[PDB]
């Protein structure tokens with residue numbers, strides 16, 4: 001099955017993130033399912049190394065855009081699915097306003113029946129008493145627009161957006177995302193006209209779970 | 225139950241895995257082979273699974289298992305490395321290549337079943353594009369060095385310092401200053417050594433049957449002094 005064919009039903013997901021922020025090292029594993037026909041994810045993440053040194057919401061965008069719902073008239077613009085099963089590399093720079101920066105590199109691809117997202121994350125120049133290392137971010141998420149454009153030279157796409165993180169004092173912590181994706185195989189892909197992804201996400205907990213963790217529900221639809 | 229030196233009485237299988245990123249160039253190296261700490265000997269083969277390395281093989285040598293150093297009878301009480309096993313230790317370094325970039329490394333060295341494993345993550349920053357490393361101007365060989373070890377009583381570990389001498393193709397020598405710190409992974413007691421050193425000698429060769437970018441390594445190390 002190739003491209004969009006791999007997403008004609010519920011697909012199991014494995015996510016693994018190795019992170020290092022200001023020298024603080026942690027690992028997160030996530031598992032669950034995605035249904036691209038309706039643009040839906042259901043995931044549970046565990047911090048296997050103990051309590052995270054950063055707030056869970058700062059990791060959400062790093063922790064599978066192939067599961068976005070692309071309506072039929074837009075299927076010709078679905079770079080993410082078109083790269084499957086071989087997959088794509090996803091890199092970002094994330095600038096937390098008045099604070100540090102995340103640099104991330106990931107491979108998103110099928111390993112057998114499972115869609116896997118393996119990530120390496122760096123965090124630099126974070127303030128010890130800032131919102132991130134100070135854990136002042138609310139455990140929730142907001143709704144965003146992800147702008148996507150083609151990158152013909154690299155046979156891929158670029159994306160940019162700003163995440164809004166609610167701070168415990170009512171303020172909002174912005175995080176500017178700059179994104180590049182490039183196919184792993186060689187490996188023809190869909191190169192899209194400009195469009196966007198509309199995102200909505202809920203962060204919850206598992207009442208039976210004692211480990212530091214995050215339950216995530218996400219709905220994303222392509223438009224424009 | 226097999227613990228400390230006891231786990232080095234014979235020839236031990238070794239697995240080494242290095243994930244590297246130098247000036248944005250990414251690579252992965254796996255090595256397999258054997259070590260015999262009674263005579264201080266390593267015999268190892270490394271493969272670059274990601275293709276041609278962006279840096280010379282000799283620059284990775286020190287990163288790619290000091291528990292296999294031969295500690296003579298009078299020195300056994302200074303052997304921090306073996307005493308930490310099987311749970312193992314974290315080994316961290318900063319390596320400054322003079323007039324060039326820097327390696328930052330963090331590794332876990334420990335037993336996994338019967339195998340001694342060395343798992344490493346490496347960052348390289350500020351390297352010059354036309355320098356000895358990114359320019360691949362280093363000879364495929366190695367020299368003999370002295371690794372100075374000192375105890376770190378506060379952290380229940382050890383610190384080390386030394387300078388590697390890398391032969392350059394033009395007859396010059398590229399120095400690489402190593403700064404090293406090791407801390408036990410487990411909560412058991414360990415040996416904290418007096419000041420001493422390790423005397424190192426290493427040969428780099430090739431496997432005439434091997435098509436992949438690779439390095440065969442032969443190493444002898446003895447503690448002294």
Ligand SMILES: [Cu+2]
Pocket residue numbers: 020120122245345346347
């Ligand atoms: Cu890294």
